[PDB]
């Protein structure tokens, strides 16, 4: 039940189904051909960056974003107990937990990447909002855009907020302050409400996916995911 995927970027994505295809793990080396290997437990969904040593500057785009997700990434979709796509305004609840393993070397973030879109499906780049949630970072890396709030309270935690404009979507990043290696029962509905209040999210958009992993600029070996869960609910109770 343990698989190792080194699919080289920048144009190939290696995608591994885990936990009955409730989640998928992707190499997603979207900006590099440097060696990157993931080791993935398909029963538990745990994974590790077992081989990586990225080099380059700490500015601009990262080399890679190896990640686990529920929902659709560029048309590659999970198939069990999904709850997405769903219009943000129609979400009943949305909760996630993530436990990570970090290394005190290199330059990276430890981040959720959450996509929204005007229509419920897309084959490519979402056109709504990218919501990032940085549990931690090191090595001097910073979020896209500009810091627009400092030490704000959202969904029971304290954050700095960064907002930016990409070519066809808006980005908002919640930077946990101080950083940590895990988060439990994070209320994404509360995050979405805040992002809408701050002008970064149209709540008529569809939520496409919830991803978590590491944007890596330098290093990367030994970063990992111990456990990951996403629950997005809708509809009413009904048994047959
Ligand atoms: Cl910007
Ligand atoms: Cl689950
Ligand atoms: Na499940
Ligand atoms: Na660079
Ligand atoms: Na980024
Ligand atoms: Na991004
Ligand atoms: Na809530
Ligand atoms: Zn990708
Ligand atoms: Zn906290
Ligand atoms: Zn905690
Ligand atoms: Zn905490």
Numbering used by the authors: 2 to 241
What sentences appear in the manuscript?
GuxA is a multi-modular and multi-functional enzyme from Acidothermus cellulolyticus whose catalytic domains include a xylanase/endoglucanase GH12 and an exoglucanase GH6, representing a unique combination of these two glycoside hydrolase families in a single CAZyme. GuxA on the other hand contains an N-terminal GH6 domain linked to a CBM3 followed by a GH12 catalytic domain linked to a CBM2 on the C-terminal end. GuxA shows an optimal temperature range between 75 and 80 °C for all three substrates, which is well above the optimal growth temperature of 55 °C for A. cellulolyticus.
